[PDB]
C-alpha cells in the first residue's frame, strides 16, 4: 500500500455534487 | 571542506550529499559517547568554520561598502543572511545553524552599525518603506542595534506630528 | 529553633521551625526583614486566624511531616464540620 | 395494530401476490386504507407497501392493489439511499427510478401524479432520465410532463440525463424543447456537465440545438471543463461551431494537453507533447495577430522554468518527463488561474508520484504549494494535512531528516484549517453536522501527530521558537473535541485515533515530549471534559506502565510540575488516585502527590456539604468545586 | 484471548484468536501465511474434524485451556490425507 | 512480519514478528544484511536450538508478549525438568 493508490478523486466535490444531480 | 562550502558562496554549487555526509560524519562518529557527542565535530569543524565565515564575512562586508550606497547594501547583506541560512541548512547539523548565523550577523551587520545608524536618520525622515523594512530585520538580531531607530521613530513621529498641529 | 504561632486571641502555639516552614507563608514571613537569628523565640504573629483554627493547623504541620513519605494507610485528618470552610480559609492563607 | 400492515408491507417488498391477498381478504374500507398506505420502516428506509412495490418493479402487485382497493397516488415516504434521503415521494417516482415501464404504466393510468414535486422540487421525468429509459421519459412527457421544472438548484431533466452517457433520452429531450442554457446553481448549463462527462454526442447534439457556450458562475466555459476532464474527442469539436473565436480554442487546447500532462487515468507523455506543439503551432501560425501568453512569475515550488516561449525551449524539453510534468501543471493553473477546485487535485497527485520514488523533499514542496493553494481557496484541507503527517512519519521512519522550515509551515496551515473547523462548526446546520464535527476532530488529530512529528526532529532554535509559537497560538484558540476533550488529554490519552499508514508507527500517544511541548506552550493543565476528567484522570488510566514507563513518569511528572490537582474529582468524585487502573501509576502520583490541609479542608467541606456561597474567597469556591 | 500452535508436518504457527472467533479469521490467516486455499486445507483438532462454522469458544479452545504458556494443539492436513503431524525431539535425560 | 524460526531438525516454527523481536538476537538477526525487505520469509535458521526447545522459546514470546504490562501475579511459565538446562542455553544465545 502506498499514497499514489490511496489518493480518491474528487469525491468530497461529487458528495457536494450528488445534492444537484438527486433524480 | 572549508573550500567547498567558500565555492558554494562563491557562486558555485558543489556535491551536496558528500559535503553534508562527512560534516555530519564528525557527529556519527562519536554519536555512542555519552558525554558531548558534539565535542568532536565542534572543535573539528565547527570552531574552524566559524573563524573561516567571520573571515569571510568581515571581508565581504568591507568589500560592500566600498561600492555600494546604504540603500541596497541592505538587500545585499539580507540576500546573503538569507542563502547564509539556507547553505548552513545543506551542510551543516542543525545545532550549528544559530551559531553561524550569528557569526555572519556580528560581520555583515552588527561590526557596521556606525555605519546602519548614521543612514537611519535618513531611512525615517524620507519614509522609505523598503528600507525601514531591511533596517528592522536587520538590526533586530543585533543587540544593541534596535534603540537607536527606536529612538529616531520616536524624534521623527515627534516633528511630524509638530508640524501637522503647530501651524 | 522554635516558631512562636501567636492566634487572633494571643494563644501562643510554640512548633518546631520545619514542621512550621511547611505552609509557604510562614516561611515567607520567616525570610524577608523578619529571619530572627538568634532562635529563642521567632514569633509570628496572626491578627486573624483565632485560635481553634491556628490549633488544627499546627496539628496539620505535625501530622504531615510525621506522614510525609508513607504512602501507605494513611490516615485521615478530622476536619470538624463546623471547623471546616475556615481551616479551608486558614489553609489558603498559609499555603500548604 | 401493525402485525397486518408490516406484513403486508413485508408482501410487497417481496412481490408475494398470493400473500398479499390473503392478507386484504375480508378487510373493510378503513382496513385497506390502512393496510395499503401505512408507510413502514425496513432496511432504513421508511416507504409505503406500493412506494417498495414500484421500486421493485413488482406490476402486479401494484396493478392489484390500484384497479380494485383504488389506493391513492399521493403517498409520501424515504425512498433510495447513497446521498438520496429525498421524502415526500410517490410511488410513481420510484417506479420512473427503477427503470420499470410497466409499474410507470399501471400508475399513470391509475392517476399518478406525473408532474408530482418531491422535497428537493424532484419530478418523477427527472429521474425516469437519470435511470436512462426512454419509454417511462417519453410515456410520462406525453401526460404533461413539465421539464423545465426542475430542482431548488435549478437543475433540469435535461442536464441530469446529459451527466450519464445515454444517447436516446438526451436526444429525445432535445427534441423535446428542452432549455440549452438552463442555468445550475453555480450557473452552470448542461453542455458543462456533458463535456466533463466524456460524451462526444451529447455535446454534438447540443451544439447543434444551438447549446450558446457561456462561461458558469466560476467564470469556466465548458470547454475548459472539456479541456480539464481530459476528453480530447469532446473538445475537438467545438472548432467548427464558428464560435471559438481564436483565443477560447487554444487556450482550450493548452488546458487539454496540461490536462493529459498529469492525471492519474489520463497520465501520457507523447499525445500530451503532440497537443502542446499543435497549441503552439497554431498560436504562432499567422505572425499578423499572433497570440502572447501572459507569463506567470516562476514560482520556486515549480522549479526554475520560465515557460516555453521558443520553439527550441519546447523541443529541449520534450525528451524528459518531468520537466514536462511540472510545465503542465504551471499552465494548468495559468489558465485556470490557480483559485479554481480543479487545481489541486493534479499538484497533490504528482506529489504522491514524486513521493513514489523517495523523492521526500520534492513530494513536501509540491504538496505545500498545493495546501497553500486549498488554503487561500477556502478549502477543507483536513486530507492534506493527514498526508503530510503520513509522508513525515515516513520518511522519519526511514531515518530521513525532517526540514524544520516545512514543518513549520504545515503546522501554520494546520492551526488556521483548525480555526477554520471552529468557525465552521460553530455556525453548521443538523445536515453535516456530524461531519463538521468529524473533521474537526480529524483536524485536531493531525496537529497532534505533526506535534509528534516535530518532536520527533531536531531543529535549531529559531525553528523551534516557530514551532511552538503556532502550538501556543492553538492552545490559546483553546479547542475541544466532542466529548470535551482538550489538546492535553487528547495527548494523554492512549485511545486517540492515530492514522494507521503511516503516523502509527512513529506517533505513539500518549507521548511524553507533545505534552510537554504542550505544556511549555502554556497549555491549560486543568481542563476537564463533559466526563469532568482531567489529564491526570485520563493518564492514570494508562493500560501499558510496564512496557512504556518512560512515557508514563515523564507525562505524570510534567502534569504535575506544570500544575495540577492530584485529588481533584470529577463528575463522579473520583479522584485521579480511584481512576487509576495500575498500581504503577497509583504510586507515581502518589510520589508526585503533596499533602495540603487546603484540600483536606476542601474535602471535608464538600462531604459534608457545608455551604461555602460567599464564606470564601473567590478562588476558593472554585477549589471546593472540583475537590 | 486464545491462543494456538496451528500444526502442520513441521510446520507449526502461533496464532492468537478471540474466544468469539470463528474458524473462518484462522483459515484466512493460514490461507495468507502459508500460501494456501482453505477450499483445500481443513484443520483437525486432536483426531477429529472441524468445519468452517462454528466458532473457537465452544469447539473447545477457552482461554484457561489454551493460554500462552502452552497453547493448544490444532492439526492441518494439505492435498485425503491423514493427521501426521511430526512430534518435537525427544529431551535429553535428566543428569 | 511473520517471520519463521527453524530449529535444529527442520520444525518450522512461524511466530509473529513483534513476538519474535523480544529476543536480542533475533532482532539482531533479522536486522543488517537479514533484512529482505520482501515480506516473503523472514526465514532465520537455528542450527543449534532443538525443536524442543525452540518450541518453550516461542511459547515464551507469546507468554511475554501477552503478560509484560500486567505485574498482577501472572502465571508462572511452565518449565519442565528436561527442558530446563537446556531451555537456559537458548534464553541466553537469544537474549530475553
Known amino acids: 500500500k502506498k499514497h499514489s493508490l490511496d489518493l480518491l478523486s474528487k469525491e468530497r466535490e461529487l458528495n457536494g455534487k450528488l445534492r444537484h444531480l438527486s433524480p | 571542506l572549508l573550500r567547498e562550502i567558500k565555492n558554494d558562496r562563491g557562486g558555485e554549487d558543489p556535491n551536496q550529499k558528500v559535503i553534508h555526509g562527512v560534516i555530519n560524519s564528525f557527529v556519527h562518529v562519536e554519536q555512542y559517547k555519552k558525554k558531548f557527542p558534539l565535542k568532536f565535530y565542534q572543535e573539528i569543524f565547527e570552531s574552524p568554520f566559524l573563524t573561516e565565515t567571520g573571515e569571510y564575512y568581515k571581508q565581504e562586508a568591507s568589500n560592500l561598502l566600498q561600492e555600494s550606497n546604504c540603500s541596497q547594501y541592505m538587500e545585499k547583506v539580507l540576500g546573503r543572511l538569507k542563502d547564509e541560512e539556507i547553505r548552513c541548512r545543506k551542510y551543516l547539523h542543525p545545532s550549528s545553524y544559530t551559531k553561524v548565523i550569528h557569526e555572519c550577523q556580528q560581520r555583515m551587520v552588527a561590526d557596521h552599525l556606525q555605519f546602519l545608524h548614521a543612514e537611519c536618520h535618513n531611512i525615517i525622515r524620507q519614509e522609505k518603506k523598503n528600507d525601514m523594512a531591511n533596517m528592522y530585520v536587520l538590526l533586530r538580531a543585533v543587540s544593541t542595534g534596535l534603540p537607536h531607530m527606536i529612538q529616531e521613530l520616536q524624534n521623527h513621529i515627534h516633528d511630524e506630528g509638530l508640524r501637522a498641529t503647530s501651524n | 529553633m522554635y516558631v512562636k504561632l501567636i492566634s487572633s486571641d494571643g494563644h501562643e502555639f510554640i512548633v518546631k521551625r520545619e514542621h512550621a516552614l511547611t505552609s509557604g507563608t510562614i516561611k515567607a514571613m520567616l525570610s524577608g526583614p523578619g529571619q530572627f537569628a538568634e532562635n529563642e523565640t521567632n514569633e509570628v504573629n496572626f491578627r486573624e486566624i483565632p485560635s481553634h483554627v491556628l490549633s488544627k493547623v499546627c496539628m496539620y504541620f505535625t501530622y504531615k511531616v510525621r506522614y510525609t513519605n508513607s504512602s501507605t494507610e494513611i490516615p485521615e485528618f478530622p476536619i470538624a464540620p463546623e471547623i471546616a470552610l475556615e481551616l479551608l480559609m486558614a489553609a489558603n492563607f498559609l499555603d500548604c | 395494530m401493525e402485525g397486518l400492515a408490516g406484513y403486508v408491507y413485508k408482501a410487497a417488498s417481496e412481490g408475494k401476490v398470493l400473500t398479499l391477498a390473503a392478507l386484504l381478504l375480508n378487510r373493510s374500507e378503513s382496513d385497506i386504507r390502512y393496510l395499503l398506505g401505512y408507510v413502514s420502516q425496513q432496511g432504513g428506509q421508511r416507504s409505503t407497501p406500493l412506494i417498495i412495490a414500484a421500486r421493485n418493479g413488482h406490476a402486479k402487485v401494484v396493478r392489484l392493489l390500484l384497479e380494485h382497493y383504488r389506493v391513492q397516488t399521493q403517498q409520501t415516504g424515504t425512498v433510495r439511499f447513497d446521498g438520496y434521503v429525498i421524502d415526500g415521494a410517490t410511488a410513481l417516482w420510484c417506479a420512473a427510478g427503477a427503470g420499470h415501464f410497466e409499474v410507470v404504466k399501471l400508475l399513470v393510468s391509475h392517476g399518478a401524479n406525473v408532474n408530482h414535486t418531491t422535497v428537493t422540487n424532484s419530478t418523477p421525468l427527472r429521474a425516469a432520465c437519470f435511470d436512462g429509459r426512454l419509454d417511462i421519459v417519453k410515456y410520462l412527457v406525453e401526460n404533461n410532463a413539465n421539464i423545465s421544472i426542475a430542482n431548488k438548484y435549478d437543475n433540469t431533466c435535461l442536464m441530469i440525463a446529459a451527466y450519464k452517457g445515454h444517447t436516446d433520452v438526451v436526444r429525445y429531450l432535445l427534441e423535446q424543447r428542452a432549455d440549452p442554457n438552463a442555468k445550475a446553481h453555480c450557473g452552470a448549463t448542461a453542455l458543462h456537465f456533458a463535456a466533463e462527462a466524456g460524451h462526444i454526442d451529447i455535446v454534438k447534439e447540443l451544439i447543434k440545438w444551438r447549446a450558446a457556450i457561456v462561461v458558469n458562475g466560476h467564470g469556466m466555459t465548458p470547454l475548459k471543463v472539456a479541456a480539464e476532464s481530459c476528453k480530447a474527442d469532446v473538445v475537438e469539436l467545438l472548432l467548427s461551431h464558428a464560435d471559438c473565436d481564436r483565443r477560447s480554442r487554444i487556450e482550450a487546447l493548452e488546458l487539454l494537453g496540461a490536462s493529459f500532462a498529469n492525471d492519474r487515468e489520463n497520465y501520457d507523455i507523447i499525445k500530451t507533447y503532440h497537443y502542446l506543439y499543435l497549441a503552439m503551432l497554431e498560436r504562432f501560425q499567422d505572425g499578423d495577430n499572433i497570440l502572447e501568453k501572459e507569463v506567470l512569475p516562476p514560482i520556486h515550488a515549480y522549479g526554475n522554468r520560465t515557460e516555453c516561449r521558443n520553439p527550441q525551449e519546447l523541443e529541449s524539453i520534450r525528451q524528459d518527463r518531468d520537466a514536462l510534468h511540472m510545465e503542465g501543471l504551471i499552465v494548468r493553473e495559468r489558465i485556470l488561474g490557480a483559485d479554481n477546485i480543479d487545481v489541486s487535485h493534479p499538484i497533490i497527485y504528482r506529489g504522491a508520484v514524486y513521493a513514489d520514488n523517495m523523492e521526500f523533499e520534492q513530494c513536501i514542496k509540491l504538496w505545500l504549494h498545493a495546501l497553500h493553494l486549498r488554503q487561500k481557496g477556502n478549502r477543507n484541507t483536513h486530507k492534506d494535512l493527514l498526508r503530510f503527517a503520513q509522508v513525515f512519519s515516513q520518511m522519519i521512519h526511514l531515518n530521513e531528516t525532517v526540514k524544520a522550515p516545512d514543518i513549520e509551515c504545515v503546522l501554520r496551515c494546520s492551526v488556521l484549517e483548525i480555526e477554520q473547523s471552529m468557525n465552521r462548526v460553530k455556525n453548521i446546520s443538523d445536515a453535516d453536522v456530524h461531519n463538521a464535527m468529524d473533521n474537526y476532530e480529524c483536524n485536531l488529530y493531525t496537529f497532534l501527530y505533526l506535534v509528534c512529528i516535530s518532536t520527533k526532529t531536531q531543529c535549531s532554535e529559531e525553528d523551534q521558537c516557530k514551532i511552538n509559537k503556532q502550538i501556543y497560538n492553538l492552545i490559546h484558540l483553546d479547542p475541544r473535541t466532542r466529548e470535551g476533550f482538550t489538546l492535553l488529554h487528547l495527548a494523554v490519552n492512549s485511545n486517540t485515533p492515530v492514522d494507521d499508514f503511516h503516523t502509527n508507527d512513529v506517533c505513539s500517544f500518549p507521548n511524553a515530549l507533545v505534552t510537554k511541548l504542550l505544556l511549555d506552550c502554556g497549555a491549560e493543565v486543568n481542563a476537564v471534559d463533559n466526563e469532568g476528567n482531567s489529564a491526570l484522570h485520563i493518564i492514570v488510566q494508562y493500560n501499558r506502565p510496564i512496557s512504556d514507563f518512560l512515557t508514563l513518569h515523564s507525562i505524570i511528572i510534567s502534569l504535575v510540575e506544570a500544575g495540577a490537582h492530584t485529588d481533584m474529582t470529577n463528575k463522579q468524585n473520583k479522584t485521579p488516585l480511584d481512576k487509576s487502573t495500575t498500581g504503577v501509576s497509583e504510586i507515581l502520583l502518589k510520589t508526585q502527590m503533596k499533602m495540603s490541609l487546603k484540600c483536606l479542608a476542601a474535602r471535608a467541606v464538600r462531604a459534608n456539604d457545608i455551604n461555602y456561597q460567599d464564606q470564601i474567597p473567590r478562588t476558593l469556591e472554585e477549589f471546593v468545586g472540583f475537590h | ?95
Open chain 5, 1 to 95: 484471548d486464545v491462543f494456538l500452535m496451528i500444526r502442520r508436518h513441521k510446520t507449526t504457527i502461533f496464532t492468537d484468536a478471540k474466544e468469539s472467533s470463528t474458524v473462518f479469521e484462522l483459515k484466512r490467516i493460514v490461507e495468507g501465511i502459508l500460501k494456501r486455499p482453505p477450499d483445500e486445507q481443513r484443520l483437525y483438532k486432536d483426531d477429529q474434524l472441524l468445519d468452517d462454522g462454528k466458532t473457537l469458544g465452544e469447539c473447545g479452545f477457552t482461554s484457561q485451556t489454551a493460554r500462552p504458556q502452552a497453547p493448544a494443539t490444532v492439526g492441518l492436513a494439505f492435498r485425503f490425507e491423514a493427521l501426521c503431524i511430526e512430534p518435537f525431539s525427544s529431551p535429553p535425560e535428566l543428569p
